[PDB]
């Protein structure tokens, strides 16, 4: 359902075609103003004609989009407009929808902008952890499960597609002390402090510790864990390395900027 963008682009293209025709026929109403060496108006004429051709081509290309207009006559919208004439004395519902959309977008933008708040300083619950863990596990290809073997510590474990599972410990909040290990583990009947790797997942554990020390927000730990999980999800490909080659070293990954590249290059 991305037809709204195509429709907006088509509207803009038609408006551009109209404006280009208007500009062409307004400039053609004026000869060479002042050349004194050679009539350079032919260049502007050719540019305007090429712009008209560009707009026509853009309209023809947008014609390829907009596959079909589905049925479902406004998707349960007609209840009093197309329904009983008593019911529609109706615009209140549409006004409420538009106002809610505008309020949501405006509040989102305002929050994203005021994220850099001028807060000087801060001066003058083992039930929601399972819920937050389940809400985070609701994401695809991120099957996790917490064990809590010793005390209130949430010694959970994650695994995305590979056998590179990560035993990320927690403290009922602001989870820290993570250790990544690939291709087998859980010795005995619990987690471990092995951290064994092939000199590659050691860098991954270092980056994960840096991230855990990086996302330390003053409040809202649920958003912190969600950001941590969507940051960790970027390790599902490992098939990119800008600013260098793919194999500059043995390993290649550091995406704090949502673009993983070769290490020792940041």
């Amino acid at each position: 359902g991305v037809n709204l963008e195509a429709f907006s682009q088509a509207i803009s293209a038609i408006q551009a075609l109209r404006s280009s025709v208007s500009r062409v026929f307004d400039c053609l109403k004026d000869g060479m103003r002042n050349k004194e060496t050679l009539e350079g108006r032919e260049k502007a004429f050719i540019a305007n004609f090429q712009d008209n051709l560009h707009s026509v081509n853009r309209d023809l290309n947008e014609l390829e989009r907009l596959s079909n207009l589905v049925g479902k006559p406004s998707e349960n919208h007609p209840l009093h407009n197309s329904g009983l004439l008593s019911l529609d004395p109706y615009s209140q519902l549409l006004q409420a929808y538009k106002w809610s959309n505008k309020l949501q977008y405006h509040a989102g933008l305002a929050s994203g902008l005021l994220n850099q708040q001028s807060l000087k300083r801060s001066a003058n619950p083992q039930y929601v952890d399972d819920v937050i863990s389940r809400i985070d596990r609701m994401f695809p290809e991120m099957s996790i499960h917490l064990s809590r073997p010793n005390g209130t510590s949430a010694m959970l474990l994650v695994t995305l597609g590979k056998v590179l599972k990560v035993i990320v410990v927690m403290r009922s909040l602001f989870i820290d002390r993570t250790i990544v290990k690939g291709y087998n583990t859980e010795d005995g009947k619990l987690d471990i402090w092995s951290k064994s790797s092939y000199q590659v997942f050691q860098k991954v554990t270092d980056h994960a510790t840096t991230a855990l020390l990086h996302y330390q927000l003053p409040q809202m730990p649920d958003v912190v864990v969600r950001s941590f999980m969507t940051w960790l999800r970027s390790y599902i490909k490992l098939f990119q390395a800008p600013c260098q080659r793919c194999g500059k070293f043995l390993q290649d990954g550091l995406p704090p900027t949502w673009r993983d590249f070769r290490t020792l290059e940041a």
């Binding site: 106002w99 505008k102 405006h106 305002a110 005021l114 001028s118």
Partner: protein
């Protein structure tokens, strides 16, 4: 012709902040027909809602800090009294935390003494 040499401005920095705050909300509240379209306009609205607000907030903060400077250079006794009060409050808070920790420790000691009957 304000962009010229003169620039009238008076009775601001408090009511001006309040006015900006209550005014850049008008994009949300209005006894008008909310149009059935919204794109790249609420953004440029909230931009100037937030920027001028933060600017006037920082202006007020700088005014408060300048007042603090003039007060410290004109009357350090108030700063000394405030420091003494803060130290007293910190001492009281530390004593309360220590008392709570001692109560919890004694409770746990009694719990262990009652549980180690074996």
């Amino acid at each position: 012709a304000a962009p010229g040499a003169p620039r009238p401005s008076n009775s601001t920095l408090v009511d001006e902040l309040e006015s900006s705050f209550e005014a850049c909300f008008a994009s949300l509240v209005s006894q008008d027909y909310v149009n059935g379209t919204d794109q790249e306009e609420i953004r440029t609205g909230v931009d100037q809602c937030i920027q001028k607000f933060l600017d006037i907030a920082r202006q007020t903060e700088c005014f408060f800090l300048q007042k603090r400077l003039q007060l410290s250079v004109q009357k350090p006794d108030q700063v000394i009294k405030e420091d003494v009060s803060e130290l007293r409050s910190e001492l009281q808070r530390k004593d309360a935390l220590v008392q709570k920790h001692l109560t919890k420790l004694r409770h746990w000691q009694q719990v262990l003494e009652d549980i180690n009957v074996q």
